[PDB]
Amino acid sequence: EKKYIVGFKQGFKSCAKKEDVISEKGGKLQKCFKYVDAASATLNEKAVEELKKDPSVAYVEEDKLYRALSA
Amino acid sequence: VSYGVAQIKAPALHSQGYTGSNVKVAVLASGIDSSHPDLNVAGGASFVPSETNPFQDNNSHGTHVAGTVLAVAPSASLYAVKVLGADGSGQASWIINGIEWAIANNMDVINMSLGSPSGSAALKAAVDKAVASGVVVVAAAGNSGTSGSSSTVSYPAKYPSVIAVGAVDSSNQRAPFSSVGPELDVMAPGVSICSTLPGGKYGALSGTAMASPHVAGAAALILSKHPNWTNTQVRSSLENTATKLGDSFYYGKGLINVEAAAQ
Ligand SMILES: [Zn+2]
Ligand SMILES: [Zn+2]
Ligand SMILES: [Zn+2]
Ligand SMILES: [Zn+2]
């Protein structure tokens, strides 16, 4: 739908650097990860396209749901 | 106290004086309910934006899972890492925040009794980094039954770095819902497992979610006996000493045997 995780190439370790890339493409940062080279964000479809094409960005993928394996 | 603890041969460890003391187990689930007079939850954090209390479990599964870890490893210290809400679902990013918390707070074991049929590169990165940092990472294999010859193992259990745990009943027969595939590592009890529930209650649940914490608890037992073994060594001991139930697609290496895993 609209929740995504944006993964980054080398050189974007600080949250400020991730946030600036996502912001420049019109996205809204949600959280920067500490170890994983990525951040969650909310993105419209134009922002997704533009981030995918941005040399700083390794991938853009849906922030998909996982569920308890219990009945 | 459930049949499953004897089935995996945890009592042998208890008899030797190993009950999981000073081993930190992160339960990445729907919280762990403070209604229990003895889970000894040592801390935690919530990454479910609208449910900020990790000690409130509005689903029930987190509390049940925690209780199984403790049945297995009675002196272990549990951490409530709430990454799933009341409906039992959570975003990839919330789970990754949970995993990262566990890494930062030097957890010894991560239990993830959760799944999705498709994966997330970022979530693979999170579990991989955790294993890299020395954490034993355990997940329920999935409850998707069979689909021909295809794997039905869920992610994150499907990632190589993660121990994938399928479910057997008390007769060592695979549960009909238990996922299958070459990614299955081991089996543990997962049918009508009695454990702790919200509201100070205690009852049966079924799923690979109930199997996984038997393995997490086994890892805690092994690490209490063998504090110098690495996660790789803990994982290999569990897999290499399992009781073969004949048949890797359906059972992996077979049923864990904590007595055999620990020397
Ligand atoms: Zn015992
Ligand atoms: Zn209790
Ligand atoms: Zn795996
Ligand atoms: Zn030792």
From Swiss-Prot, chain B:
Main subcellular localisation: secreted
Protein origin, superkingdom: Bacteria
Cofactor notes: Binds 2 calcium ions per subunit.
Residues annotated to bind Ca(2+) 2: A157, Y159, V162
pH behavior: Optimum pH is 9.0.
Cystines in this chain: none
A biological process term (GO) from this entry: sporulation resulting in formation of a cellular spore
Start and end residues of each Peptidase S8 domain: 2-262
Temperature dependence: Optimum temperature is 48 degrees Celsius.
Chain sites annotated for binding Ca(2+) 1: D38, V69
Name under which the protein is recorded: Subtilisin BPN'
Gene name of the record: apr
Residue span relative to the full protein: 111 to 382 of 382
